[PDB]
């Protein structure tokens, strides 16, 4: 509980299928035209969840990827590119490597989560919704 | 290979505004950031702005109220305009390009011109 | 903004010493979002550094960058007669961009 404003400020990217999210170079950022050229450019990091199945065992649900800009959110000290478990890195042409800490993140009591939308032309990955 | 050259005048009375152009050559304005910074005779650097070359811009907020940058891609020139100046800006001005080869987008300065002094005097 | 102090503002060492180069700065700007400068006489500054820890291409490896958070250290070995300069630490990790006040390396004979 007391999740505060460190939210996504959009909705996640559900993996149906066994492969992690990935996207071509200069795609995957999402559309937010409240933001500026050099903002684009962050992380999706991979949550997992579990529930109890019914035969009593516990049971991994999909895995949802949320996006954060560059510099906020969970991994806001790791550095864009880094090599790290359950991140990938995402950045549009015009995106300069400092931290979006002016956009930060989402206080889910103030603002709900913004529909997760692509431009036109994205590559969207198999097994992605 | 690229080249940059800043322009304009070397003396401007208080409370006028200086203007200043960077001129590149060896390359496109197209596709890069280019930013100005200044650097007061014996004293440390100060960064001031940048534009992308479609137009958008940043400015050091201590400026913001005075600065104004702009490009020309027809010219393969930026400029810079700092209005209502006084002997704070005297200072060796810089233009710059931002690139950063490696492709992890960091803002480094890795061209510059040569700097132009303006000396800000009656 | 962010302030960032150098120290010491003057070092003065022989050929061959390894130079150690303090930039402290104000609040945290995390682990790769500082550059140093090296600035000679009538020049304009040249990239030595990036993302805290990264070297510019035409540079050789003994100069070397280091730190996180807010201490960052510039660590040149090797100490050359014409690596005298003024070095600058340069932060982006919060706008406005700003610079150190500068390290001032001589070259002892």
């Known amino acids: 509980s007391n999740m505060n404003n460190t939210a996504s400020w959009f909705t996640a990217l559900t993996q149906h299928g066994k492969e992690d999210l990935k996207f071509p170079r200069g795609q995957g950022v999402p559309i937010n035209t409240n933001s500026s050229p050099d903002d684009q450019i962050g992380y999706y990091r991979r949550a997992t969840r579990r529930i109890r199945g019914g035969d009593g065992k516990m049971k991994d649900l999909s895995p949802r990827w949320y996006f954060y800009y560059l510099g906020t959110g969970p991994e806001a000290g790791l550095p864009y590119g880094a090599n790290k478990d359950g991140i990938i890195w995402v950045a549009t042409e015009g995106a300069l490597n400092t931290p979006k800490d002016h956009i930060g993140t989402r206080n889910p009591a103030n603002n709900a989560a913004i529909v997760l939308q692509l431009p036109q032309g994205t590559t969207l990955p198999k097994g992605f919704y | 290979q690229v080249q940059l050259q800043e322009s304009g005048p070397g003396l401007v009375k208080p409370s006028e505004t200086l203007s200043l152009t960077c001129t590149v050559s060896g390359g496109s304005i197209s596709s890069y950031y280019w930013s100005w910074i200044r650097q007061p005779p014996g004293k440390g650097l100060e960064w001031i702005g940048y534009?992308?070359?479609?137009?958008?811009?940043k400015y050091n907020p201590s400026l913001k109220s005075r600065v104004t940058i702009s490009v020309d891609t027809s010219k393969n020139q930026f400029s810079l305009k700092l209005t209502s100046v006084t002997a704070a800006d005297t200072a060796v001005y810089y233009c710059a390009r931002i690139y950063d080869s490696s492709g992890y987008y960091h803002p480094v300065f890795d061209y510059w011109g040569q700097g132009t002094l303006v000396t800000v005097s009656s | 903004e962010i302030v960032l102090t150098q120290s010491p503002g003057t070092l003065s060492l022989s050929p061959g010493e390894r130079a150690t180069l303090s930039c402290r700065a104000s609040?945290?700007?995390?682990?790769?979002?500082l550059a140093w400068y090296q600035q000679k006489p009538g020049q304009a500054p040249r990239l030595l550094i990036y993302?805290?820890?990264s070297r510019a291409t035409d540079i050789p490896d003994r100069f070397s960058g280091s730190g996180s958070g807010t201490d960052f250290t510039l660590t040149i070995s090797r100490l050359e007669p014409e690596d005298f300069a003024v070095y600058y630490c340069?932060?982006?990790?919060?706008?406005?961009?700003?610079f150190g006040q500068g390290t001032k390396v001589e070259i002892k004979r």
């Open positions: 609040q945290s700007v995390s682990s790769s979002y």
């Open positions: 993302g805290a820890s």
């Open positions: 340069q932060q982006y990790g919060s706008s406005p961009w700003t």
């Open positions: 534009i992308y070359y479609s137009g958008s811009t």
